[model samples]
Target: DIIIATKNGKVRGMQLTVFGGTVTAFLGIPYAQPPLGRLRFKKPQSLTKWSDIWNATKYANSCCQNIDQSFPGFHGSEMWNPNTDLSEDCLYLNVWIPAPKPKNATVLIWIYGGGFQTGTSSLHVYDGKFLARVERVIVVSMNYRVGALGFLALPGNPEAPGNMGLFDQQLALQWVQKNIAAFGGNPKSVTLFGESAGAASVSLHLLSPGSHSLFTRAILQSGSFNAPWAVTSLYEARNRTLNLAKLTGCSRENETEIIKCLRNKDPQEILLNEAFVVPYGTPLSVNFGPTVDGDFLTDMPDILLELGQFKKTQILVGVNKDEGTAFLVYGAPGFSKDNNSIITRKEFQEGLKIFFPGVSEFGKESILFHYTDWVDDQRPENYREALGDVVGDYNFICPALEFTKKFSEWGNNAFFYYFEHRSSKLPWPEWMGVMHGYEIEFVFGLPLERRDQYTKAEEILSRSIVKRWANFAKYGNPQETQNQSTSWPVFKSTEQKYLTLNTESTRIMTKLRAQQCRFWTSFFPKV
Candidate 1:
């Protein structure tokens, strides 16, 4: 009775409770065959049709990554960590559909954020049941390869042009478009949403032709492909690939030889040796992540945005108030002091050294002068905040601004938000403010799961945020009513209007971090 027919097979889902009724969850539904052996590092292949029912009642293996590794300063809790076994054959999707499924149900597809190094669809925070029950929408999330396994590219080699992770996502979307209606979702109404690296993935999908028309809308939380850390250059990619080969004890040889050596290496061994390709003190850089493959990415994401070689669609773009703190906390120690409230000038210069390695000492000093607080530039205690601001602006906030500007200029609707509410219950330091990925708790309605633990004010904000996200999924606009008084403004390059989601209140704002972004994105590069 729990069986639903899919294009490839019949998937048997399980029943779970909503507030009033029940919802059916189909977990670990394979969207493609296992990318193993000779299939490794290649694009996803469609799975063969099956005669028997697929027991999609349990979570499947996550992609090969160092799942059990301890990530200090990543998050206050392990809520986002993977819970399932890890393997290369992790190209599966999870679906949740409310019972007595609505005729024209909205579909929200989630992609998790883990810096393109680690992520899994089975994390507790991404549980789709609550969202499906409350929003009355079908929810889907898929597992994709990460780290060197997913993005190790050899330029000019069509077989290994890289971005297999993106290819994994595209295949999953194709499945959603072709088979979602069988699970009671409206195929035409699918909206893609993700945080951090996942958000960057959403932006890349905007440029990928194979991903166009599969989803009509996208929500980018704290990231975009245009971010400096999101994608590396061909030279960088090749260096990482060669470094990985050296780490795995392979010879310094041809690209084909390197790949063949890797295929023979154990997956776990490859991931184990896939440690920091960048220096340990580096911030906001992923060595073995996405890059511009001639076919998949075509050009750098910024150029793609400028050239209008992307899909035109509704976009909701945003970033947290203090996304940089998380990166600095664990990325490079000794930068912040006194519960992360201060940074000494000596360390600030060191930061400038690591952040802009090629800059001359005079250039570093000039950049430092531009970043420091004008009111208290002499005080050592005030300098760390300026460095954190530098990190946040360059990697998260500024890229978000650029993305929304271009998307809107292309004649597409782009709504923007800035989440400023830091959760008091979290174990992180207070100075961290609303750090990266904090908005996810409210977006998934996870706070509603334990209502008494959070304040009524927090719940008030939570209810409004979740509804805005779901409404965006349904209508491509966050507002559903004719009450123009309460509506969030559409983003335009001239006005740069955005909604500010704070614990105290939600209201419209314009020109967020305008001066900082203007310097960071425009004139600072020349400096």
Candidate 2:
């Protein structure tokens, strides 16, 4: 046991041995003032200095959110439920320090993903113990508000500018900058990394002036700011807030009164109502999420990217091979049956319309033609599979690729990868192609009980993956090491090359989905 002094107070942490080395874990450290009472819906405030020693040995209460239950076609969210105390006072972060306390150790901060609706940093899958020990770096994870409590926007109220969750994450980074050194971490060498909504959050920080110089490198996995579901317009955001306001007996006409009323209501009551308001049929299904507040996010991310408004930091970005499979299983109910799965032409059209709300029929038909496989069968599963592929490409894969290209074009170092390794155990169908979030387990070296199941090939891949991430955190370039036999080439707009991580082989590949992505650029027009 050790007690570390922070600006606020002394914090006690635990030491454990793993991967043949010692590591220190400091959990449940508060980084901001609790967002309860009148503080609710407002920007996070800096934590007040404490006069007494603060206990930091156990996980803190997770942000207020309804318990995630299993839904047909979707079970990923269930894995993120905290299963611990829940409260509005959930702005806490955890840290893992390598033993022997190397001076100036590289720091990696993780942000959790739950579609911007449900997640906690305390999830076992996100434990920093293994990553910290194996990679010999400091690791940190934090809780940010989710659901309406985090993202609700009121048009004229500066107090609730939306993107409160993103703000919470930014404050956490500041906390890391101020206090990581006390735990043997180098603030100057911080790398911001996350998956899905977390990945989207990383990309937004690149565009946020408030986040400038907060981190020197970033790793975005499976999502980007350009993803359709990652951001909501302020107008749409207000409507969702208003819907929640009316649901809980508040007047929707007055934004200030609605927010005031919400501040007085129970946080659980707000969360339960939020659960019913998300549009589950759509991809990334949440009614309240990051909004383009005129201050933090002045405009659409794609527009900002085009205008060269983002910070030019080194980055590593990529996506899974079958990102659409998990999403379609949950979203394409219209194309599923008890025994078969097929999205008929009409159903496909409807799905397209729902996915692209403003697109004309001609645009939807053009997209349909572009993705249709003439030789593939039209079985229920086949049709739904095809539809899933389109959703994955349109919503995730293509946008990630596009963002990488734009970031590279701006003359900053960017490394891209395509994650294709699949687990032997079938959680979903074999056709889901590695599915979304599969790489996360491997990236963190997998849990103890599941580690032995990996094939020798997977074991090598997992270690290499962690090393690449750690190397990037330490040196800004993932392959900038004397030990590396293979070089991860810098991404270039012209060559369109990327590293491919798979059980078969890890090598440099050029023109990742060139044809499909090119067609998508024209098909979507805006991205």
Candidate 3:
């Protein structure tokens, strides 16, 4: 066993060979005291250092939540569920470092994204062995709280302040600062990265004063704090918490008093009843996520972005080419009944109303007109594509573009990209394109996981991603470590330049969803 001493305790880890090199694997080390019993719905507590040697060889439990497989036999849905058991005692972090133990190696901390409901660091899809082995850097991933167990809160309740999940991330980062050096990681050269809700958490951390100085750089993939679904107000979260409480047979006259009552309820019961709060698999208006507790998140994420009150770290942010395809299936009606379902014009119109209910009839028509491809015929397939683009522009693409522009204007280096690579690895239909989170397996070097299963293109692309990602963690620029890959430029509001990453060839492009995003972002305010 490979041993490392830390402030918490002396931990015993295991060593494994990946790509013909030794990677010391430290799995399931507690970064915070477990949130059990009365500590539920509260911030993660610090642990007093122990003298005993803690065995860190095996994976730990995923945070308690129903494994949501509501996407109807989709391979992507089947892919990300945790390999481990689920429970409340699951605030753990895992680390992978190159052996021979080089001192001060750059660190990449990964946060998993399961829409703030379900995710864990123990999934094989996010395994860091390949990245750590190939990039010559240390990799770390932490398991934070999810579902109502993680995010439900009442306004001004100090005992049960919301955003405990993001707080869990903060505590894990603090753990890295104190103990990463023991495992040959450089605390100062840390880069926080994630996809979806993980990406949004990274963005929220950028805007939070409580999260400042924890990470030096960040890489956000297909998510941002400014996204419409990323942040919910405390009033909404409070309502969700009360509803969840009522469903679990813990109704109370005083809303704040429900927190005390919830502590006595079984965690499994809360997990079972949590789904009643939000109807859709992936609702456009999310019920439980990061709420503005005024302690963790002082204000709305958009206001924080506009005020330039965020960390001044260099950031790389972008989305998949077809970011909204899956959301259409998850959030829209009649879209998920069949694998090869075609969307009619009527379905498209109805989808617009469900996604944009606040808009007037004129606004809905204008939105449909802007999204519709007037040149191409509006057939069954065409309307389906158009509606997906509407969801993409209004939800994912525009917010990322707006954040990058504002981030660049605030005197921080902001790099952007379009992950346009749609792989044959996904068993879904071709029309899905590069849907949300398809790049993660490649980014974490799944190609290296099993070489025989991947083509030369996948290998080359995966290596390039690992190199650039490690470079960003090490040198504050993704292009810094790439000798063969094309150099990427800093994104500016005027030029809007961003690299398009695909297997064919990496090329620089500008103005992704330019017109449609403007229709949503710039024109809608007037409407």
Candidate 4:
């Protein structure tokens, strides 16, 4: 056991061999008091000092959520075990550092993603030992509250002014600022990174005034503020709160009374029934998540981007090649059961309405014409491919490009990439391409259990990815690594340069998905 002293008290961790070296791992370190009983639905409070040494070897219970495996074609949150224990007292963080820890190592903090409804830091895929050892940097992963308990915004209730999840994250960073030095991490050289909703969370931090000096750099993968599912309107958020209160037998009249009543109910009872779950194949999907709270989020993220109202920092952002492949396969309305099944034109038209409810008939037809290969005989494979492209572009790829464009235009040191490295470990066919969250394995160099599954080409690509990521953490530029020959150019709106991270060939491209992006901005001017 390796004992370390933090501001609060002393803690004991363990050492494990990883990547040809020993690394210290401190798991389940509480950064905040348990948000149970009176603390339910409240902002995180710093954990007080303890007289005894804290045992941080085992992972604490994950925050309350249902990682259900029973639903057919349900892949969301499927990367973790449904049997994992959970609890309301789940505000915990994990840390990893190379043996004989050096002073001033760059720290990498990870926030997980499950559409802001379900996620845990204890997932095997998120183990930071390999990253710590290979990258020569300290790695930290923390859990925050999710779902209704984490982000319920009442109309004017200052008691529970929403964005509790963001507050939890902010508190975790505060803990890091106070205690990371004891574990051999540099507070000034910290890097915040995540995928999907977590990426969106990172983007929010960049825009939050309260989180200005928490980190010096960021890496956002796949998701961003521009993604439709990232943030919700306050009106809709308040309506969701009312619905939850009514469902749980709480007072929905006075906002203060509603908060008190909801706080009195069983935490599990409230979360089990109130947590928003995205149903299968529901078109134009929306869920109860982060709101534009006047405090945490002053205005819409798009507006903030337009006004350049964000902390200036070096950033690396990108999207996967087929980010919507998994979404379309699991929850899009057009998919069929049979291998050769094709969506009829009528069915396709109806699906478009669900996906683009606000679009005019002419706009919908234009989208169809742009995505579909009309010369093809409307074959099932062709239609599926076309729909996949549309969903991927509309939901993730285009939005990411737009954000990158604005971010670069603001003269921030922005580095953009297109991740096209499809993993062989995926069960789907090669044609499906690189689905969402597939890059996590490469980013963390795959866990010990699944490392053997990687081919030689993937192994090479994984090394490049980890090295480049770690280099970015250590230095603002990704090309500051030992292998400086492959220079990654800074993103500029004029050239639209982006790196293509792939097993087959990694190269730079200009004006990526130009036609599709132009179509999206032209047709959907509101977004």
Q: Which of 1 and 3 is ahead in lDDT?
A: 3
Local accuracy of candidate 2 as per-residue lDDT tens digits, 244-361: 7778898656667777888888986888787555533365566688888877788888899998899987999999988877765555556432334555777777777767666677
Model 2 misplacement above 4 A: 71-77, 275-281, 334-359, 375-381, 447-452, 480-485
At residue 2, give the lDDT of candidate 4. Answer: 84
Off by over 4 Å in 1: 67-77, 279-281, 335-341, 358-363, 377-381, 480-485
Each candidate structure's TM-score, on Cα atoms with residue i matched to residue i, is 0.94, 0.93, 0.95, 0.93
Where does the lowest 10-residue lDDT sum fall in candidate 4? 277-286
Question: Could you say which candidate leads in lDDT?
Answer: 3
Q: Model 1, range 265-361, lDDT digits (tens) per residue?
A: 8897888777756644265557578888766677777888998889988999999999887766654446432365465677777777777666677
RMSD of each: 2.3, 2.6, 2.0, 2.6
| Deviation (Å) of 482 in candidate 4 | 4.2
Off by over 4 Å in 4: 70-77, 81-83, 275-286, 334-341, 357-363, 373-379, 447-451, 480-485
Quick one: ranking by lDDT, best first?
Answer: 3, 1, 2, 4
Scored by CA lDDT, what does every candidate get? 0.82, 0.81, 0.84, 0.80
